[PDB]
Amino acid sequence: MFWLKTRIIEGEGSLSRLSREVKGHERVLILASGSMKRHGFLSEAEDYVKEAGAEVFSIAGLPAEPSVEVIEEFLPKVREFGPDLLVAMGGGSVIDTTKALKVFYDAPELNFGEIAFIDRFSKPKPVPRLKTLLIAIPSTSGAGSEVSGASVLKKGGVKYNIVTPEIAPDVAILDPRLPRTMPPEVARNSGLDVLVHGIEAYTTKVASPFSDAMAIKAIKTVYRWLPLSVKGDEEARARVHYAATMAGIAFLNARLGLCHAMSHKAAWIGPHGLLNAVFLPYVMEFNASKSDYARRRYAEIARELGFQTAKDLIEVVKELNEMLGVPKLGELVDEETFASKVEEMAEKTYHDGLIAFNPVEPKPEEIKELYLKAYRGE
């Protein structure tokens, strides 16, 4: 099974094509991150929507970590303005917020509780056909969220998933100018997100040749270019920006695995892509020892980078962490804070629906010793 609902416009200055894509439309709403205001990209985009003869209304400065509580502040304003096209311009959380917004805006009657996964034993009601077009313009590189029909919200501090094709964007615009404004830390952290997505997508149970083609290329590109991107090279920024969407196309179809689940639960420690990379080598080790499939697949990636064995890949990834100056896990959290929460973290990683796609099904106890190997810096 391989599909892609989203239509992808890439290119230097491709933001200008927002002119073509809004034709026909009356009242366009842009949700935007702070930085997209500051660096003037929000202005540019506002021009294009006027250019095309439509009303535009902007909310900038949306906070990280999407939540219902946050969305509920705007929602009244959004209803007042009544847009017939949504545009998200920002990172993952701007785009994911905008997806959740479409649901509430197009289907006001729906109950949030009816229609959100929390764990693997959650069945929700499916989401009915929605109507309002969604254009996604990512400014990091990147979350993949601009091609995916998934969105992750908090209500009352609890993490929820919403999963439907209806909220996968109709168009994504990939303009390398935008992520050239990333500071090096955010370049690094989101860039490792891509690599980790790539590798998990390649080693789930539902991988296809088609999703494999996008994963492999994304991996090859991030390995080659990310160190240069982090240091600010213009070309490199553009190459990793496209690789981020490639990996998005891949895990849209193939889903993800144990590293992601573990990094979801460890999210209070620090940033999502940072922890992902920190756990990756340990998760790879676990998967390869227990699974003849994982070992084969890691080995295939290794060869695509001009090495040989699954051991080579794990070492390649440890080395790339060291190169880019990724912290040890115990430079972020003290040992008692950690060992307290570590019982409850391995519990709820077990109840995550993503481990159905992992090439091994771990028990809660094995998961715990993984969190602890990684703290050991083994």
Ligand X SMILES: NC(=O)c1ccc[n+]([C@@H]2O[C@H](COP(=O)([O-])OP(=O)(O)OC[C@H]3O[C@@H](n4cnc5c(N)ncnc54)[C@H](OP(=O)(O)O)[C@@H]3O)[C@@H](O)[C@H]2O)c1
Site residues for a second copy per CB under 8 A: 1-4, 7-10, 208-210, 212-214, 216-217, 221, 239, 242-243, 245-246, 249
Among 181, 227, 228, 333, binds ligand ATR (CB under 6 A): 181
241 assigned ligand-binding residue:
no
**Contact positions with ligand X (CB under 6 A) in 52-111:** 64-65, 90-94, 96
Is there a contact between 259 and 155 (Cβ–Cβ < 8 Å)? Answer: no
**Token pair 């990793």 in the structure block, residue:** 240
Nearest CB to ligand X, comparing residues 92 and 198: 92
Burial 232-249 (b: 16+ CB within 10 A, else e): eeeebbbbbbbbbbbbbb
What residues contact 193, with CB distance under 8 A and at least 6 apart? 142, 143, 144, 244, 272, 273, 276
Q: Is 248 annotated as a binding residue?
A: no
Residue 60: helix, strand or coil by DSSP?
strand
Q: How far is the CB of 193 from a second copy (least distance, A)?
A: 18
Task: Select from 180-188, 201-209, 251-259, 285-293 the region that touches ligand ATR (CB under 6 A).
Answer: 180-188
Pairing of β 133-138 and β 158-163: unpaired
Count how many Cα atoms sit within 13 Å of the Cα of residue 256 in the half-sphere of its side chain.
26
The pairing of beta strand 27-32 with beta strand 55-60: parallel
Looking at residues 182 to 241 of the shown chain, list those that interact with Fe ion (rule: CB under 5 A).
193
Closest by CA position to 276, among listed 290, 258, 301: 258
CB atoms within 10 A of CB 134: 23
Determine contact, residues 174/278, Cβ cutoff 8 Å: no
CB closer to Fe ion, 146 vs 193: 193
Please tell me the distance from the alpha carbon of residue 67 to that of residue 71, in angstroms, as a whole number.
6
Instruction: Write the interaction track for ligand X spanning residues 187-226; mark x where CB under 6 A is met and - where it is not.
Output: ---x--x---------------------------------
Instruction: Find the shortest distance in angstroms from Cβ 194 to Fe ion.
Output: 8
Cα(48)–Cα(64) distance, rounded to whole angstroms?
27
56 lies in the site for ligand ATR, by CB under 6 A: no
**Among residues 83, 92, 257, 359, the one that binds ligand ATR under rule CB under 6 A:** 92
Whether 177 has a binding-site annotation, put simply, is no
Binding mask 296-335 for ligand X (x = CB under 6 A): ----------------------------------------
> Quick one: 89 or 174, whose CB is closer to a second copy?
174
Candidates 116, 186, 278, 324: give the one binding ligand ATR (CB under 6 A): 186
Binding site for ligand X (CB under 6 A): 33-35, 64-65, 90-94, 96, 139-140, 142-145, 148, 150-152, 159, 178-179, 181-183, 186, 190, 193, 272-273
